[PDB]
C-alpha cells in the first residue's frame, strides 16, 4: 500500500545494467583490477572488489621533541602540516609519479603496473626520501590488509610475504633492501614489524601510533648510531575472523629509495634498473600522448601552461576511487533505512575529503577524463547509473564503506529520496554522441533506459506550481539563525533565493537543466531509434526552448535579468540579541510574492546552457551584466554573485561563511566560456561582443589558476574575486581540472 512505495524507494532499478555482468573481475577488466583507488590515503593500492586486498604507506620523521611523539603520516588531512603534494604524472592505468613536501623532507612515490596472468597482473612501488634543498632520520611503513578468513605466510629476517585469495589466487609481497637514489648499491636499514588482526581501515593510524612505544638503535657501518621509536624488533603474531594487518617498518638516514613489489602467481623482474627504465618509458609515452590529445604546444600555450595542464589531468586521474557498501536513505513522505550494497568507480572532488562520490561534480570530472580515456568514462557512468532506485533517484552524495563514513553520526550521512542534483552526467553524453565511436554507441544503447528513468524522475519529482515551472525540493527549514535558507540540492549551497520559502517558488537554474536534459536525451533517442522516447522528449525540449514561456516564468523587467520567484523581502539582517546570539531580523517592507534580486550565476543560466537564440532580445542584457565590473566581471574570472549585492561576502550564520556569494568557481566559468565560444562563432547581432568577452575571460581565468599554482603548488576549490588567491579546500581535482579544457578550447556542443 504505502509500505510498497517505501520498499520501491529502497530497491535497485529493474532495468538492464549499463555495465557487463561481472565488469570489475580481472577476467573481464584485467588492466583496471589494481589501482590507486583509495584517494584519501597519500599512497596506497586496492582491488576493484567487495572483499579487497589493500596496501598502503605511512611515514614519520625521527628526532622529534619529547613528551610529544613523532607525527605519523597516512591520510590526506588538510591541517596536518604536510604540503604541497600531488600527482605530476598518472595515466589512470599503468603508472604514476607523485611528490610530497613535508617540512624538512621531500618524498617521491612512484608506481608501474605490469600485466600478465589471470588475476590482474603485477605492480612495483619506489619511495624516495630526500632532504629539502641535512641528513634526517626517517621511518617508512609498508602494510597489507587481508579480508575475513585470509591469512599471510611470512618468510623469515623478513624476506617476503605470500598469500592466497579467491580473486587474486597465489601472490607474493616483497620489501627490497634500500639503496641511495639513482643507484642499485644496497644501504643498511633497521627493521621493525607488527602483525595481528585487522582493526578496521579508519583505525590503522591509531593502532600504529599505539605500538610505536619502544626505543631502538640504528647502527649503519662507518657512522655514529642513532636512536629511534619503533614497532617490535622481531616477528610475532599478536592475538576473530576480520582479516589480517601486517606492517613493516624501515629506518635510515635520507637520501634513500626503497622498493615494494607485488608478484602474481599466474603471471610467473620489475626492480632496480628495469623499474627505472619502465618509469622513463612511461613518462615519455605520456608526454607524447598528452600533446596528441590536447595539442597545447601546437595551440601556442607556454611551457608553464603545458605543465599546469599535465598536473590538472594527473591529479584528476590520481583521485579516481573504488567504493563498496550500503548508503543511508530517507524515503519521501520517518526513520533512516539502508540502501542495497553497491559498487562505485568514480572521481572525487578533493583528496582532502572523506572518500565520497558527488553526483553533479562527476559530470564535470568526466568531461576531462573522456578526452584522455573513453573506457574510464564508460566505467564511471555505468557505475553511477547502477545506483538508481526503482523511482529513478540517485543520492547526490555517495558514502560507501567504513573510511567514507569516517566516524560521522548517521543523522548527517542520510540522503533524502525527495532531493535532486544537477544532471551534469548528461554533458559527457553529448561528446560521446558527437564522436560516433562504436564502443560509445554500444554503451549508450544499453544505458538509455537508465538515463531516461533518471531524467524522467527529475522533471516529475521537482515539478513547480505552474506548467513548465520547476522548484528544487529541500531548501532549509526556516530557522531564526539562518539569514537566507540554503538550497543544498542545487549545488550552489548559499546562493540567495526567496527569503520565505514556499510551494509558490519558481527556480530558474532547475528549469534550464530540465530543458538541456530533454534536448540531450531527445537527440540520443533519435540516434538510437527509440521511437516512443523521442516522441515524448522532442516536444518537451521544444516547449522548454520556446522564449514566450521562459519570459512569462522568469523574465524580471524591474531587474533587467532572468530571476527566481518567491515570497521575498530584501529587509532581512543578522543581528546579535542577548541571550539568543546572532539571529535573523525581518524588517519592513514585509515579504510578498515577486522576483528575487540576486544577480549572479543563477541569472545567467539561459546563456550558460546555450538556450537563448542568437537573436534573442534577452541575450544582449545578460552579456552586459556578465561584462560589468560592478557586477560579475572580476580580474580573475566571473563572480558567483554581484559585488553590488546586499548578500556579497555575507555569512549565512555565525558558523557559515559566504560560499557562492562572490567567489570565482571554475565549473561555472567553464560553462560561461563554452557559451561565449558558441555565441562568438554563430551568426547573430551579438557575435562580435561574445567573441571578444570569450578571449578576455579565457586569459584571466588561465593566468590566475597558473599563478596560484606557482605560488602554492595547488589547484583550489575557489578563487578570491579581489586578489585571485586560492581559497577553500585543496587539492581540488575536482572540477578545477577543467582549466585543461579551457587551455585546449575543448567545449562540448549540444546544437
Ligand X SMILES: COCCCCCCCCCN1C[C@H](O)[C@@H](O)[C@H](O)[C@H]1CO
Ligand Y SMILES: *[C@@H]1O[C@H](CO)[C@@H](O[C@@H]2O[C@H](CO)[C@@H](O)[C@H](O)[C@H]2NC(C)=O)[C@H](O)[C@H]1NC(C)=O
x-or-dash string of contact with ligand Y, 624-663, rule CB under 6 A: ----------------------------------------
x-or-dash string of contact with ligand X, 312-351, rule CB under 6 A: -------------------------------------x--
Q: What DSSP string runs through 664-686? A: B-HHHHHHHHHHHHHHTTS-STT
Among 39, 189, 491, 517, binds ligand X (CB under 6 A): 491
**What is the residue whose three cell numbers read 541575450?**
619
By the rule CB under 6 A, 74 interacts with ligand Y: no
Q: Which does 87 bind (CB under 5 to 8 A by kind): ligand X, ligand Y, none?
A: none
- Residue 559 CA to residue 400 CA, distance in Å, equals 45
By the rule CB under 6 A, 500 interacts with ligand Y: yes
x-or-dash string of contact with ligand Y, 457-496, rule CB under 6 A: ----------------------------------------
Q: Please report how close the Cβ of residue 509 comes to ligand X at its closest, in angstroms.
A: 12
Q: What DSSP string runs through 188-211? A: --EEEEEEEE---GGGHHHHHHHT
Q: Please report how close the Cβ of residue 499 comes to ligand Y at its closest, in angstroms.
A: 8
- Give the contacts of 322 (CB within 8 A, at least 6 positions apart): 35, 37, 46, 47, 48, 52, 343, 344, 345
Radius of gyration of the chain (CA): 27
Whether 717 is a known active-site residue: answer yes
Selecting among 130, 332, 476, 493, the annotated active-site residue is 493
Per the structure block, which three cell numbers stand in for 310? 599535465
By the rule CB under 6 A, 361 interacts with ligand X: yes
Among 27, 285, 408, 593, binds ligand Y (CB under 6 A): 593
Interrupted after residues, the chain (C–N over 2.5 Å) = 133, 156, 239, 268, 333
Please state, as a whole number, how many other Cβ atoms lie within 10 Å of the Cβ of residue 167: 18
- Residue 556 CA to residue 537 CA, distance in Å, equals 28
Residue 126 near residue 259 (C-beta atoms within 8 A): yes
Q: Which does 403 bind (CB under 5 to 8 A by kind): ligand X, ligand Y, none?
A: none
- Residue 160 CA to residue 172 CA, distance in Å, equals 7
* Stretch touching ligand X by CB under 6 A, among 99-107, 356-364, 505-513, 633-641: 356-364
By the rule CB under 6 A, 39 interacts with ligand X: no
- Give the pairing of strands 342-346 and 321-325: antiparallel
By the rule CB under 6 A, 80 interacts with ligand X: no
Among 191, 228, 294, 358, binds ligand X (CB under 6 A): 358
Residue 197 near residue 244 (C-beta atoms within 8 A): yes
- Residue 447 CA to residue 624 CA, distance in Å, equals 41
Q: Which residues sit opposite 556 in a β-bridge?
A: 561
Residue 730 near residue 716 (C-beta atoms within 8 A): yes
Cβ-based nearer residue to ligand Y, 203 or 502: 502
* Stretch touching ligand X by CB under 6 A, among 57-65, 134-142, 352-360, 604-612: 352-360
Q: Which does 500 bind (CB under 5 to 8 A by kind): ligand Y, ligand X, none?
A: ligand Y
Among 25, 108, 118, 567, binds ligand Y (CB under 6 A): 567
Q: Please report how close the Cβ of residue 86 comes to ligand Y at its closest, in angstroms.
A: 49
Q: Please report how close the Cβ of residue 455 comes to ligand X at its closest, in angstroms.
A: 19
By the rule CB under 6 A, 591 interacts with ligand Y: yes
Q: Please report how close the Cβ of residue 584 comes to ligand Y at its closest, in angstroms.
A: 12
By the rule CB under 6 A, 422 interacts with ligand X: no
Tell me the site size for ligand X, rule CB under 6 A: 9
SS3 (DSSP) at 314: helix
- Give the pairing of strands 54-61 and 137-145: antiparallel
Cβ-based nearer residue to ligand Y, 133 or 477: 477
Q: Please report how close the Cβ of residue 478 comes to ligand Y at its closest, in angstroms.
A: 8
The residue sitting closest to ligand X, measured at its beta carbon, is 349
- Residue 323 CA to residue 347 CA, distance in Å, equals 11
Q: Which residues sit opposite 594 in a β-bridge?
A: 566
What letter would DSSP give residue 233?
Answer: S
By the rule CB under 6 A, 255 interacts with ligand Y: no
Q: Which does 745 bind (CB under 5 to 8 A by kind): ligand X, ligand Y, none?
A: none
Per the structure block, which three cell numbers stand in for 682? 554563430
What letter would DSSP give residue 179?
Answer: B
- Residue 516 CA to residue 430 CA, distance in Å, equals 11
Q: Please report how close the Cβ of residue 640 comes to ligand X at its closest, in angstroms.
A: 10
- Residue 412 CA to residue 423 CA, distance in Å, equals 23
Q: Please report how close the Cβ of residue 658 comes to ligand X at its closest, in angstroms.
A: 12
Q: Which does 593 bind (CB under 5 to 8 A by kind): ligand X, ligand Y, none?
A: ligand Y
Cβ-based nearer residue to ligand Y, 591 or 728: 591
Q: Which does 443 bind (CB under 5 to 8 A by kind): ligand X, ligand Y, none?
A: none
Q: Please report how close the Cβ of residue 400 comes to ligand Y at its closest, in angstroms.
A: 40
Q: Which does 538 bind (CB under 5 to 8 A by kind): ligand Y, ligand X, none?
A: none
Maximum pairwise Cα distance, the chain: 86
- Residue 388 CA to residue 56 CA, distance in Å, equals 32
Q: Which does 457 bind (CB under 5 to 8 A by kind): ligand X, ligand Y, none?
A: none
Cβ-based nearer residue to ligand Y, 16 or 590: 590
Instruction: Show the 3-state SS of 475-534.
Output: CCCCCCCCCCCCCHHHCCCCCCCCCECCCCCECHHHHHHHHHHHHHHHHHHHHHCCHHHH
Whether 493 is a known active-site residue: answer yes
Selecting among 305, 717, 721, 746, the annotated active-site residue is 717
By the rule CB under 6 A, 502 interacts with ligand Y: yes
Cβ-based nearer residue to ligand Y, 497 or 519: 497
Residue 349 near residue 329 (C-beta atoms within 8 A): no
x-or-dash string of contact with ligand X, 493-522, rule CB under 6 A: x-----------------------------
Residue 107 near residue 117 (C-beta atoms within 8 A): no
By the rule CB under 6 A, 360 interacts with ligand X: yes
Among 84, 116, 354, 727, binds ligand X (CB under 6 A): 354
**How many helices and strands (H and E) does the chain possess?**
17, 33
Q: Which does 567 bind (CB under 5 to 8 A by kind): ligand Y, ligand X, none?
A: ligand Y
SS3 (DSSP) at 451: helix
Tell me the site size for ligand Y, rule CB under 6 A: 5
Peptide bond into 589 cis (omega under 30): yes
Cβ-based nearer residue to ligand Y, 571 or 582: 571
By the rule CB under 6 A, 353 interacts with ligand X: yes
Residue 75 near residue 41 (C-beta atoms within 8 A): yes
Binding site for ligand Y (CB under 6 A): 500, 502, 567, 591, 593
- Give catalytic residues, as residue numbers: 493, 717
Binding site for ligand X (CB under 6 A): 349, 353-354, 356, 358, 360-361, 491, 493
Amino acid at each position: 500500500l504505502a509500505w510498497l512505495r517505501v520498499r520501491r524507494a529502497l530497491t535497485l532499478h529493474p532495468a538492464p545494467s549499463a555495465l557487463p555482468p561481472d565488469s570489475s573481475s580481472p577476467a573481464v577488466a584485467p588492466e583496471l583490477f589494481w589501482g590507486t583507488y583509495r584517494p584519501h590515503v597519500y599512497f596506497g593500492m586496492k582491488t576493484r572488489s567487495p572483499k579487497p586486498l589493500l596496501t598502503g604507506l605511512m611515514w614519520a620523521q625521527q628526532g622529534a621533541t619529547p613528551g610529544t611523539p613523532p607525527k605519523l603520516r597516512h591520510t590526506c588531512e588538510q591541517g596536518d602540516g604536510v604540503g604541497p603534494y600531488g600527482w605530476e604524472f598518472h595515466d589512470g592505468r599503468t603508472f604514476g609519479r607523485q611528490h610530497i613536501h613535508d617540512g624538512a623532507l621531500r618524498l617521491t612515490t612512484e608506481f608501474v603496473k605490469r600485466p600478465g596472468g589471470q588475476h590482474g597482473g603485477d605492480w612495483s612501488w619506489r619511495v624516495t626520501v630526500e632532504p629539502q634543498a641535512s641528513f634526517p632520520l626517517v621511518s617508512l611503513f609498508f602494510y597489507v590488509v587481508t579480508d575475513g578468513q585470509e591469512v599471510l605466510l611470512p618468510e623469515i629476517q623478513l624476506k617476503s610475504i605470500s598469500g592466497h585469495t579467491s580473486e587474486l589466487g597465489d601472490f607474493r609481497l616483497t620489501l627490497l633492501p634500500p639503496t641511495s637514489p639513482g643507484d642499485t648499491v644496497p644501504k643498511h636499514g633497521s627493521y621493525n614489524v607488527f602483525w595481528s588482526s585487522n582493526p578496521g581501515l579508519p583505525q590503522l593510524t591509531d593502532m600504529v601510533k599505539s605500538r610505536l612505544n619502544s626505543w631502538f638503535q640504528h647502527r649503519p657501518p662507518g657512522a655514529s648510531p642513532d636512536r629511534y621509536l619503533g614497532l617490535p624488533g622481531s616477528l610475532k603474531w599478536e592475538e576473530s575472523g576480520q582479516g589480517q594487518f601486517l606492517i613493516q617498518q624501515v629506518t635510515l638516514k635520507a637520501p634513500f629509495s626503497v622498493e615494494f613489489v607485488f608478484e602474481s602467481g599466474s603471471a610467473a623482474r620489475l626492480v632496480g634498473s628495469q623499474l627505472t627504465q619502465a618509469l622513463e618509458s612511461h613518462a615519455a609515452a605520456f608526454k607524447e600522448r598528452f600533446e596528441k590529445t590536447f595539442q597545447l604546444k601546437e595551440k601556442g600555450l607556454s611551457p608553464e601552461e603545458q605543465a599546469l595542464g599535465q598536473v590538472a589531468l594527473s591529479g584528476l586521474l590520481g583521485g579516481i576511487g573504488y567504493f563498496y557498501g550500503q548508503g543511508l536513505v530517507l524515503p519521501d513522505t520517518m526513520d533512516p533505512a539502508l540502501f542495497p550494497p553497491v559498487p562505485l568507480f568514480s572521481g572525487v572532488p578533493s583528496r582532502s575529503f572523506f572518500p565520497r562520490g558527488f553526483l553533479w561534480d562527476e559530470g564535470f570530472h568526466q568531461l576531462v577524463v573522456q578526452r584522455w580515456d573513453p573506457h574510464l568514462t564508460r566505467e564511471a557512468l555505468g557505475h553511477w547509473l547502477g545506483l538508481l532506485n526503482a523511482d529513478g533517484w540517485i543520492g547526490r552524495e555517495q558514502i560507501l564503506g567504513d573510511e567514507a563514513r569516517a566516524r560521522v553520526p548517521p543523522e548527517f550521512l542520510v540522503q533524502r529520496a525527495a532531493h535532486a542534483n544537477p544532471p551534469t552526467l548528461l554533458l559527457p553524453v553529448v561528446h560521446m554522441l558527437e564522436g560516433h565511436d562504436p564502443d560509445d554507441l554500444a554503451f549508450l544503447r544499453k544505458a538509455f533506459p537508465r538515463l531516461h528513468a533518471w531524467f524522467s524522475w527529475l522533471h516529475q519529482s521537482q515539478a513547480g506550481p505552474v506548467p513548465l515551472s520547476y522548484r528544487w525540493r529541500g531548501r532549509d527549514l526556516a530557522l531564526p539563525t539562518l539569514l537566507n535558507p540554503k538550497t543544498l540540492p542545487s549545488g550552489l549551497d548559499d546562493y540567495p533565493r526567496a527569503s520565505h520559502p514556499s510551494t509558490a517558488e519558481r527556480h530558474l537554474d532547475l528549469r534550464c537543466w530540465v530543458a538541456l536534459g530533454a534536448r540531450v536525451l531527445s537527440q540520443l533517442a533519435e540516434q538510437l531509434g527509440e521511437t516512443e522516447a523521442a516522441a515524448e522528449l522532442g516536444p518537451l525540449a521544444a516547449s522548454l526552448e520556446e522564449p514566450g514561456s521562459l519570459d512569462e516564468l522568469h523574465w524580471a523587467p524591474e531587474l533587467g535579468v532572468f530571476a527566481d520567484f518567491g515570497n521575498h523581502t530584501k529587509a532581512v539582517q543578522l543581528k546579535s540579541r542577548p541571550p539568543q546570539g546572532l539571529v535573523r531580523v525581518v524588517g519592513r517592507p514585509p515579504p510578498r510574492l515577486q522576483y528575487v534580486d540576486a544577480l549572479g550565476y543563477v541569472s545567467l543560466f539561459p546563456l550558460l546552457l546555450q538556450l537563448l537564440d542568437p537573436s534573442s532580445p534577452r541575450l544582449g542584457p545578460l552579456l552586459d551584466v556578465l561584462a560589468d565590473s560592478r557586477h560579475l566581471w572580476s580580474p580573475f574570472g566571473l563572480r558567483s554573485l554581484s559585488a553590488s549585492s546586499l548578500f556579497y561576502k555575507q555569512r549565512n550564520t555565525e558558523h557559515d561563511p559566504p560560499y557562492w556569494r562572490g567567489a570565482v568557481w571554475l565549473n561555472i566559468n567553464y560553462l560561461a566560456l563554452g557559451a561565449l565560444h558558441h555565441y562568438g562563432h554563430v551568426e547573430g547581432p551579438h557575435k562580435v561582443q561574445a567573441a571578444k568577452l570569450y578571449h578576455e575571460l579565457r586569459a584571466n581565468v588561465v593566468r590566475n589558476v597558473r599563478q596560484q599554482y606557482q605560488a602554492t603548488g595547488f589547484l583550489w576549490e575557489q578563487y578570491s574575486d579581489q586578489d585571485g588567491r586560492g581559497m577553500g579546500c585543496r587539492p581540488f581535482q575536482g572540477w578545477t581540472s577543467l582549466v585543461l579544457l579551457i587551455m585546449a578550447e575543448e567545449y562540448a556542443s549540444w546544437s
